[PDB]
């Protein structure tokens, strides 16, 4: 299954280097800028790579919803995470001409009783989400737990 698509050559190369190091089989889709990898490893690998810093309405909505769902699924592969919800809020093509807008994301996680996300895991989530959405800076990702505690500084 596709690990990543639409990668820069630089990111692609970095991702391939990491996969080789981890001894994970991979197949870079020919001229598809995509890297199909073991289906059962896709989510774990996305997270791991994120930790290393790598890399119509209805459709949009659907797309957005699909993206949200995928991101949630990936985040749920983290050990301490029981469930995750991702909400993406990219304003519709800035109607206002002068004012400038920017995409943001809100991530809510339900943690396993007695478990917490560490700083690394938190950073991985933030990176994963930011990388998935064009123009979404890490700073515009808010990560909260079930109790509403802000995890991202």
């Amino acid at each position: 299954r596709t690990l990543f698509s639409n990668l820069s050559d630089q990111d692609g190369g970095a991702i391939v280097a990491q996969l080789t190091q981890m001894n994970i089989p991979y197949r870079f889709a020919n001229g598809s800028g995509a890297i199909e990898v073991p289906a059962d490893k896709v989510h774990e690998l996305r997270l791991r790579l994120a930790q290393q810093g790598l890399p119509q309405f209805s459709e949009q909505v659907n797309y957005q919803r699909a993206l949200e769902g995928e991101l949630a699924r990936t985040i749920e592969t983290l050990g301490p995470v029981k469930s995750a919800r991702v909400h993406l809020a990219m304003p519709k093509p800035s109607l206002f001409v002068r004012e400038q807008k920017s995409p943001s994301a809100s991530v809510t996680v339900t943690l396993e009783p007695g478990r917490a996300l560490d700083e690394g895991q938190i950073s991985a989530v933030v990176h994963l989400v930011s990388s998935a959405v064009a123009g979404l800076p890490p700073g515009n990702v808010t990560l909260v737990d079930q109790s509403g505690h802000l995890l991202t500084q």
Partner: peptide, 27 residues
């Protein structure tokens, strides 16, 4: 410049007070 920093400071304070209220009002 400085006004934006002050406004962000106010926004963070308000958000944290909001979260503290929500934390006890949730259970």
């Amino acid at each position: 410049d400085l006004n934006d920093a002050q406004l962000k400071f106010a926004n963070d304070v308000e958000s944290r007070i909001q979260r503290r209220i929500e934390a006890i009002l949730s259970p």
